[PDB]
């Protein structure tokens, strides 16, 4: 879909769509497209563990698109970074 330049451009729902796009490419024959989407994910989230949020989720949260958004929302807020768009 459309890749926005920052988290502030994404509503939580739109971020979830990006996560399901990544899930679809996980099952594609190659990782060519997947890897670009993952680079984008790492770049806009700014979380130090990057792709681990998707592939190695912490046991204290759910391993699902909703859990990933929630973890990102709490981490960004905790580090004083702008959150998801409210639209």
């Amino acid at each position: 879909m459309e890749l926005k330049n920052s988290i502030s451009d994404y509503t939580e729902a739109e971020f979830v769509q990006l996560l399901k796009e990544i899930e679809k490419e996980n099952v594609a024959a190659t990782d060519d497209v997947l890897d670009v989407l993952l680079e984008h994910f790492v770049k806009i989230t700014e979380h130090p563990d990057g792709t681990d949020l998707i592939y190695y989720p912490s046991d204290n949260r759910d391993d699902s698109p909703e859990g990933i958004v929630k973890e990102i929302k709490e981490w960004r807020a905790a580090n004083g970074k702008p959150g998801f768009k409210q639209g």
């Binding site: 899930e23 996980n26 099952v27 792709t51 592939y55 190695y56 391993d63």
Partner: protein, 119 residues
């Protein structure tokens, strides 16, 4: 092009925990039993079947996230933790010490580079 042979080794609930050390993780005995005597057109073909069998083994699949199980289900190697990556190499690799499973091990890209560079 050849057949898969070997017995593999028993593994616990933390199979790939040491994939980043020494020679990495061994082919699980249960997986070896599924692949033994089967014929493969190529190594890549063997590798896809290998990961697919891992996704079908309840004891092994429970050790991976949903996203990683989907990758293995279509025969792709699971992604490693960010810290074990090496440039564009971001998923576990099979290292070889026709397809002898007792000579094949699962390693992270980082550890795999070192093995071949004498480290």
């Amino acid at each position: 092009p050849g057949k898969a042979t070997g017995k593999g080794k028993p593994v616990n609930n933390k199979w790939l925990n040491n994939a980043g050390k020494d020679l990495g993780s061994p082919v699980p005995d249960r997986i070896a039993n599924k692949l033994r005597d089967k014929e493969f057109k190529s190594f890549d073909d063997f590798r896809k079947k290998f990961w697919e069998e891992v996704s079908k083994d309840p004891e092994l699949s429970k050790q991976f996230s949903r996203n990683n199980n989907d990758r293995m289900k279509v025969g792709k190697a699971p992604k490693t933790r960010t810290q074990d990556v090496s440039g564009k190499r971001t998923s576990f690799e099979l290292h070889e010490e026709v397809y002898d499973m007792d000579n094949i091990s699962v390693v992270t890209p980082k550890r795999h580079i070192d093995i071949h560079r004498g480290k």
